[model samples]
Structure formats: C-alpha cells, structure tokens
Target: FSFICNYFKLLKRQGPGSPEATRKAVSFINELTDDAKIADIGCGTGGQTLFLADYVKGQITGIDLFPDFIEIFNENAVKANCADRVKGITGSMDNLPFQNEELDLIWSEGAIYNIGFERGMNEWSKYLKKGGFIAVSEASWFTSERPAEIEDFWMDAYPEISVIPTCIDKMERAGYTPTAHFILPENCWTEHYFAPQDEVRETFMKEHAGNKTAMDFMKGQQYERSLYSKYKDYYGYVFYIGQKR
Candidate 1:
C-alpha cells in the first residue's frame, strides 16, 4: 500500500499530459469571469484542475473515480495554495453530482475517453449554464492512412479515437460552438509527463523485480509511451474548447 501510494503521488496526470499544456488549454476559456463555477470531470490527480485555478478566477471542483487520485489532487491543492479555490471529490464522470445548468465551465484532460467523446459532450452540456464553456483534451488522429502497425495499435487501444475535424464537428452537433482548438506540443508529453515517469518506472522495476504483476503493468506503461514516440505524427491530444449555445 505504501509503495502504491508513493508511486501514485508522483502523478500529476493520469495520461499523456503536462502543466504547460493544461495552462494552454485553460487559456482558451477566455470568457471566464471571477465567479465562474467549473467542474473538472475525471480530474485525475488534479493536474489541469490546479492550473485552472491559476488561470481563471473561478471556483473549481475536480472529481475522479480513484481515491488515490483525489488524495494527490488534494495534496497538490494545498501545495499550490489554491485549496480554497479548488476541491477534489471522489466520484465517477458517468454520474456527475450537480444540478442542471449549475456550472459555468467543465474542463477535462485526457479522460473523456472513459465516456464516449460525442456522448460525453452531450451529457455534460446539461450541467453548463447557457453560453457556458467546455474545454477538453482528447486523443485524435492527426493524419490519415496511418501505417497499419500504428493504426492497428490505436484501433485496438481506442477504437473511438477520431480525427480533429470530426471532433470539432462533434462539438457543434453536441450543442456547443467550437471556439478554439490546438494540439498539445510534443514537450507536453515528453517533458512534464513521461520523462519523469520513466524515473519512477525504473525505481519500481528495481524494487519489484520478482513481482510479475507489477512488471507487467510497467510494460503496459512503457508500451504506451513507446507508441507516442513512434507514431506521434499519426496521433496526439487535441484541445477542444467550446461555448454552449
């Protein structure tokens, strides 16, 4: 349990991400007022959620399914001195606990895939106030006709993955007007995310050499990181920001 705690404590993210990318995405919600109410669904470890407090003068609530994630989120909240502005809840995205039209913005990073993309946007819209905002990062195909090896990998990993334009169109169809969208830079993945985790993985491997279960999980993580390094041009996370209409 202690090792698991230590391992998770290093995570500011649950997937491909970085603080700079979070700031970049939060910057797109330019309409945020001082009192905007924001909810971050699947807010793993509150990485982006903490940055949201820095960028916007809004009160933000972050929710995730894992207690460990919420634990780290709260720890970071205190460290950032934004605990008063941000709070973390242990919950699932599928059953968001809020009244209809109660939020001014909903933010997510690298977690929308837990729910279908188009379906998630449509369902979450009911929680936003009229003309409210949403900013989410999702993995998308950056190019067409990708090599079969890379294509097969993602097809098996995330069959729901789609092209960027299709996602923009999805936003419009799901009751939001697409405002701005951008792909996160490569450093966001390399520097703030995977590079640090590489060290942790090394430590974990050495400490748990005899544990097959732990090593297998580490292999999975390594495979995912390798996937990006090999096929980054084929796919990457795209930040999509929209305003409810």
Candidate 2:
C-alpha cells in the first residue's frame, strides 16, 4: 500500500483526466459567486483542483488520503499563485471534513470508487446546500454486453461499474437532478495517463532495482495498460454532473 502511494505520487495525475476534459465538465455547472465553497475529494496533488481554481471563482479545498499528495497539492496551489483561494488538506472521502450543507460545489475526478458511486452521491448530498453541484468522473461501461475478459477485469476491480444510463438514474434517485454526463476522450487515458506513467515506471525500476515486489507491481501496471489498450472501446471514464434538488 505504501509502495503504491509512493509510486503514484510521482506522477502528475493519480488517474485518467485532462485539463480539457475538466474544463468541459466545469462548463456544465453555472452560478457560483466568488465566495462559493468547493471541495475536490480524493484529490491527488490537486491537478484538477488547480484548474478548477483557474476557471471558477471560488475557494477550493482539495482533500486526499495521502499526506504527501496534499503537501504537493498545497505547494502547487502556492506556485499557481492561488494560495489564498486554494488549499489542500489530508482527509478521506468516506469522512470528509466539512459542515452539513456547507459546500456550493463538490468535484471529484477518478476517485469516487473509494466509496461506491451511489453511496457517495447519496451520502455527500448532505454536505451541499440546495442546488449545489456535484461533479465526478467515474468508470462506466459503454455497452451492456462485453467480452468476459474485460467484464471480469472490471467486475474484479469495481463491481459497481455500470452503464452510463444506470449512473444517471442513480444520480436522480439520490435526490439530484442529473445535469450533464460525458465520456472522456481516448487521449485522457492514453496520452494523459498511461503515457506519463511510462517515464515514471523507468525511474521507479531504477530506484527499486533489486526488489521483486517492485518489479511485479510494475508488471501489473503494464498488464493494466495492455488491458486498457485492448478493451478501451468497452469502457472508459464518464463525467456525471448533478445538482442537489
């Protein structure tokens, strides 16, 4: 577990997402004044949080489980010159550190799987005021029927991974009106995610040259990359935006 955190903390993003995709998702949300309170849960190094700070006029609090990532997140916020409005804190998605109905916008990318999607939408809604927006990017299926290999893989990884329609339905059932949902482009996984890992993998291997576990972990990552390349058409991340009713 420590190794996984250390390895991923070296990358620019902890998951599949891009500034372009984030910007597009933000476009679906409207009406936030300068004093709006926003929280990016499970935020890794605040990569998307910084972008949100840039495009939106609000105070963004980025929360992540890893202290190292939060440290980096706060440093990035300072570097971006939005330190006054942007801050990163070490926290968990399951137990967020915010008051009830305290947030105006809640944004999470590629991390809601820590808690199931339906559970997160239902639970986190209490933290939002009426009409507050919740935007998240989750892994979803493109079709109902898929090859067993890919199906088994996702089922093992995240059994809750469902079709996009089911996700939207869940959003509505959770007391939010589904506002917008879109699939992230292929480059979000290929160019922005996996490609950067190639460089990080090289450095990791050198750092842990004689460790068998490290090598196996790298091989596992390579296997996942191979699976994504082969079965990407069947599944990808989908951004679902909603407003509390």
Identify the candidate with maximal TM-score: 2
The total number of steric clashes, by the backbone 3 Å criterion, in model 2 comes to 0
Candidate 2 residue lDDT tens string, 1-245: 86888888788898999999999999998868889999999999888887788788988999999999999998888889998999999988889999999999999999999999999999999999898999999999999999999899889989999999999999999999999999999999988899999976767778888999988888888988988999999999999999999
After superposing candidate 2 on the true structure, give the runs of residues whose Cα lies further than 4 Å from its correct spot. none
User: Which regions of candidate 1 deviate over 4 angstroms?
Assistant: 1-6
The stretch of ten residues in a row with the least summed lDDT in candidate 2 is 199-208
Indicate the worst ten consecutive residues by lDDT in candidate 1: 1-10
Please write out the lDDT profile of model 1 over residues 1-245, one tens digit for every residue.
44554576677666667777778777766557768799999887887787678777788999988888898888889988888879999998889998999999899988899888998999999999998889999999997678898788878878889899899999999989899999999987888778878777766778889988777777877888888899999998889999999
